[PDB]
Symmetry: C2
Subunit: 471 residues, 2 copies
């Protein structure tokens, strides 16, 4: 019995400590002040890229830290001059709350690249390539690296062949590399090997694939080893003092585990040690935002991500039917199916979760939320599988909207000029496209932020004094 493994080679590593690590472990509340001190070492560690922007950090900066996201980007570009900066961008949704007209996507990408972003990991919650298409083109126009993304999930319609097809569609829209995202740590070892190998066998060894796995279920570092045996080019990790739990596998652990296998990373262990210790000293200040579960494999049976489960709980707590949780968890699968089995990541997870609670309370689709209606009617794009025509009809007969099947942005009219005018009437607006984008992405937060931005970035973390006083 034998297993074919890739030839001895160097495996690239993407550090997530500056973005996804704290987004996953301390609600994206990491203050810029607590990160800049590790930039010099991070820049000289030897990482393939440094994820430090995008995701929920834009929202967090303006909503909780009174920090300008564009200033964070500029500072990181300046303190890590020799590194490839990387961000996560939700396609046509950008970092916003809805799909935007193509010109807004163009502006955003152009300004991101202009301010220093090198690698753009573009993804769509439902894996609809059409929603990633324009952002990808904008990234290529800016001469930057376009990383098309495949959100991994487990469902009756997701298969290896299905993932290989998506990889092809991403390569067809000019992807420079393919990212396999596993936000819920659902990727097991064998599937990791099979999917990576199938993509490499189908499109060629030159096809660059970056694997992003969280450690929530505790099985993905083994998946990382299997992905490396299958030939994956780069794997995402988080410095050891900011890893595990709903976060990611440890950078140092992944580097150390390869000794003697023929595979290696070229990270500087001394630099890694300094970055570790830097965050180990700072992490305690964020205890009020930490999660309390290091390993949870329940999703392999329920299909429900811990985050999604908590939300439904709170929704079943604030109403009075905490007794129907076992019923809700049984309803979710049915709602997911009806919606076409979309991956259960934001926002699909909230939409499916909330609708599941309604069906239990008010009754079988008796009342559909505005979001669920939009998903069923195709306003978020195509689903991995065909949506239940019966539930679709009900959505149409309850929202008054006609079902659509083409890229949603095709219906969106130009809005930049409209956004610029409205933004320019806000006290604090600095007249840059960056600020207009801030208003376009977060209309209800931009006002307050522009007004207080002059006060400078803050921190919602405990102070050393508060740490001591508490101890």
């Amino acid at each position: 019995r034998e297993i074919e493994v890739s030839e001895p080679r160097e495996v690239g590593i993407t550090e997530l400590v500056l973005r996804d690590a704290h987004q996953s472990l301390m609600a994206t509340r990491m203050a810029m002040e607590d990160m800049v001190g590790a930039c010099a070492d991070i820049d000289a560690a030897g990482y393939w890229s440094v994820e430090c922007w995008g995701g929920a950090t834009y929202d967090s900066c303006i909503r909780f830290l009174n920090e300008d996201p564009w200033e964070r980007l500029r500072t990181f570009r300046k303190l890590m001059p020799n590194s490839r900066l990387q961000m996560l961008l939700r396609g046509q949704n950008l970092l916003g709350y809805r799909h935007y007209n193509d010109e807004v996507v163009d502006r955003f990408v152009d300004k991101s690249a202009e301010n220093g972003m090198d690698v753009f990991r573009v993804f769509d919650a439902m894996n609809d390539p059409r929603n990633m298409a324009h952002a990808m083109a904008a990234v290529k126009k800016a001469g930057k690296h376009a990383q098309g993304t495949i959100c991994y999930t487990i469902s009756p319609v997701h298969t290896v062949e299905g993932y290989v097809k998506l990889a092809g569609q991403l390569l067809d829209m000019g992807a420079d590399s393919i990212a396999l995202k596993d936000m819920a740590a659902l990727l097991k070892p064998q599937p990791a090997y099979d999917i990576i190998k199938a993509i490499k066998d189908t499109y060629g060894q030159k096809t660059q694939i970056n694997l992003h796995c969280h450690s929530t279920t505790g099985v993905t570092e083994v998946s990382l080893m299997k992905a490396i045996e299958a030939g994956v080019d780069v794997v995402d990790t988080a410095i050891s003092s900011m890893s595990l739990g709903p976060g990611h596998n440890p950078t140092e652990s992944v580097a150390e585990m390869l000794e003697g296998t023929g595979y290696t990373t070229n990270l500087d262990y001394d630099r890694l040690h300094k970055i570790r210790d830097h965050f180990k000293a700072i992490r305690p200040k964020y205890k009020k935002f930490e999660s309390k579960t290091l390993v949870d494999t329940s999703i392999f049976k329920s299909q429900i991500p811990g985050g999604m489960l908590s939300n439904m709980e709170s929704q079943l707590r604030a109403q009075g039917a905490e007794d129907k949780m076992d019923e809700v968890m049984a309803e979710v699968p049915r709602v997911r199916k009806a919606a076409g089995f979309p991956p259960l990541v934001t926002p699909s997870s909230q939409i499916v979760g909330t609708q599941a609670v309604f069906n239990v309370m008010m009754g079988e689709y008796k009342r559909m939320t505005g979001e669920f209606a939009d998903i069923m009617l195709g306003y978020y794009g195509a689903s991995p599988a065909d949506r239940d025509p019966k539930v679709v009809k009900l959505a149409e007969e309850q929202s008054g909207k006609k079902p659509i099947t083409q890229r949603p942005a095709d219906l969106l009219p130009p809005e930049w000029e409209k956004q610029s005018k409205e933004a320019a009437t806000l006290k604090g607006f600095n007249g840059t496209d960056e600020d207009v984008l801030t208003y376009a992405l977060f209309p209800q937060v931009a006002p307050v932020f522009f007004e207080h931005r002059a006060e400078g970035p803050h921190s919602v973390a405990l102070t050393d004094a508060q740490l001591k006083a508490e101890a």
Copy 2:
């Protein structure tokens, strides 16, 4: 490029939640009251064995919980009637502070088996087979399972061939199985595969090997997968709510990661879920005893286990030279070498660590502790490599003891009758061999314990009230 892997098969699992998990995560303070509620589910989970005795639990029971270790054993045998109970026994040292005469080993093993112990994992801190020989024979006489142990470590003298030789010596003394112990999580993936495969190739596939790895460095779950590909029969894990950090890899994670690989475990996921939730509800009460580091790979460079490092720190704090820590960490390697490269596990780690601090302060072996002197003079047994003759001489010229090279217990005279007499003069002594053993193993604690035992077992964990009041 290919890698040979074992044929599809069932992999056995040993659950550590009742012994090593809490010894490693909350200073062995887990109260019997907090464990008995999960016994029924643990007994029906499908584990190959349940480690629930030995190690530091005997000391903890009588020193901190006013609990009779023998009563804990009897209760576990009664609540888990269909399971193979397993314990850790430090050979000729038993669970005590020194080597004992062979008749004490006979008594202990006989009473352990009589009270219900099924599998005895016998080990010696310096991997000297002669110190394991008699316990192993006693285990075989009692008709129980003798698991000879190899303490894994990394040193210039430890090699695959060296481990294969030890495995042979263990099999020659009647071992029913071989345990590979990696208390510091030093076993990387390739070495795990190479050592397991070499033992299987040399002594036959019928040779049973159980792998015990902690997760301290964060690389051992990958090692577990490699060990399984190499053909390991059983791997030790800890239920997910009591895992990771200086503890072990998660039971559920290890079981889930095998899906589709051809390997499988036959654990009942529902029973595992109940055991998880049981301990998740109880673990918060032990926060005052939790460690604060989930992943630490520094040992791959320093050879110093976190626990060993902390101790030296405190010793360098309580004296005034916290400035010489970088010097101490540089001295340890030299002391280890001089001692013959013994694995850095208790008590060798403390002995080497303390001596390292002296050499830095008072000077190069200017003053040797009584323990270090005994190691250098062979009173703990043979070292993996020859000890520095120059340091040996100094030990002899400073302790007045002649160096020995034969099994230390060969010099020990009968002591049972002496132990019985002394023990019988303690208020509370119940006249059983069990109590005499308690006195023989912990002379200075037995008095206090026998006097308060009637008050019943206690807990040093926070009460629900204290948990709430604190929150």
